[PDB]
Symmetry: C3
Subunit: 180 residues, 3 copies
């Protein structure tokens, strides 16, 4: 049986930190918890779709992931991705410490309610425009699992399967989650 | 148990069009059928070969794909790949509108019979030297499947399996066909 | 079911030769056994690790291969890799022509015992500091197999599996060994 796959890459830049990172120094050599620092990455998502047959020579058209490109562009690019359980949440989002005025979207992330910060200065608005709040520690593996969940929920009308999602955190390191 | 694989890349440039392209505008956002345009690509073929044991430390020598290199270089590079059943076939190859005087090669493509255009102008000859005629819409997935068939039928005397072939249409998007 | 993987790349430069290379000319086209020449490469090791669950959002931390990066950097980079059974071993290492006075390490390579050439000229010392002696023909498949072995033997206390190792001989060609 032949299996047919297609894969597309989507790029974006973001900041995050991995607040729970723990290391075994026998393996890391240096015990410093550097992923607990505020930092950032150039991310690449690679979506793999699969069929057991071709329709008009295709698994499905590459342009059929255009809505997802739009999601990556409009929601994640040039943003800071923060775990709602991050202990620095009330420190970095002090106008939203009690976690009450967050607006959860269907895709599973939150933006702050900007109504609550009306009449704050421009730099303060820029700050809060930055945050994409998620309910998971934003590791490459976590992000990849979340994007796999989103794709799965939405791709079914195309008649193909999402077989895996890769998330490259740097050009030399990446995560992959397979949908078996 | 271990499985051993080798993979090798082969590059070429070509023109084509995907004449049958259709889009679901809910997923693509734009309904424009841009792949129906005459265009081109830098293509990359990746061949994956597999064995369950190493012979002399190898799956098989990388150079044992040289004949396949020659094929890509001599047949596909700097050519325009066209489906025999593209509706524009008669328009782009008017001297061969009946599709009879084509010379089909063992690998499953054709060139025009140049006897029938003998004495045509130099530019007309250069036009007909361009075409590689195939029996499929030349999508990334169809190209990958075709080259997989070609490799499966030839590599037997090497004692190795072809496990899959990848075809990169752009650095951002690619197809893979798995033999199994 | 979901399966989680991470992969990380490690780069190094080295010299070797494949003393035992043979070719079938129906496939290589050219019979010349060029891999038997002394030469070298830019190598890339890609380590894939797998787990059936995430812990703190991770398969395991990318930094848990820092010991492996050190091994690559300190043992393999800017070295010449030679099989102890290369017919040229006595010619290239004439002060260790009997192939004893080698110091084998747990990772499965040897360096010469420098006590034996104490007192020799500086250029002679430089020559011998170059060699990494191994018990296989140093093909890409063999290097990958060996690195896989080292990784499996070390990674067990982290509770993840080494699923495969890729070893890139050139940008265009690579080996992969899967741990099935
Ligand atoms: Zn990070
Ligand atoms: Zn195209
Ligand atoms: Zn070599």
């Amino acid at each position: 049986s032949l299996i047919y796959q297609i894969a597309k890459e989507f790029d974006f830049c973001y900041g995050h930190r991995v607040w729970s990172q723990e290391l075994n120094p026998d393996f890391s050599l240096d015990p410093c918890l550097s992923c607990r620092h505020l930092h950032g990455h150039q991310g690449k998502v690679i979506v793999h779709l699969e069929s057991r047959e071709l329709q008009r020579g295709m698994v499905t058209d590459f342009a059929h992931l255009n809505w997802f490109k739009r999601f990556i562009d409009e929601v994640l690019d040039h943003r800071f991705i923060i775990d709602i359980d991050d202990p620095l949440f009330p420190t970095l989002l002090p106008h939203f410490a009690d976690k009450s005025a967050l607006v959860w979207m269907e895709e599973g992330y939150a933006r702050v309610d900007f109504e609550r910060i009306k009449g704050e200065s421009s730099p303060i608005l820029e700050l809060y425009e930055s945050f994409v709040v998620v309910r998971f520690v934003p590791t490459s593996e976590s992000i990849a699992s979340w994007l796999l969940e989103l794709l799965r929920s939405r791709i079914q009308p195309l008649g193909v399967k999402v077989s895996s999602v890769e998330f490259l955190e740097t050009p030399k390191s990446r995560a992959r989650v397979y949908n078996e």
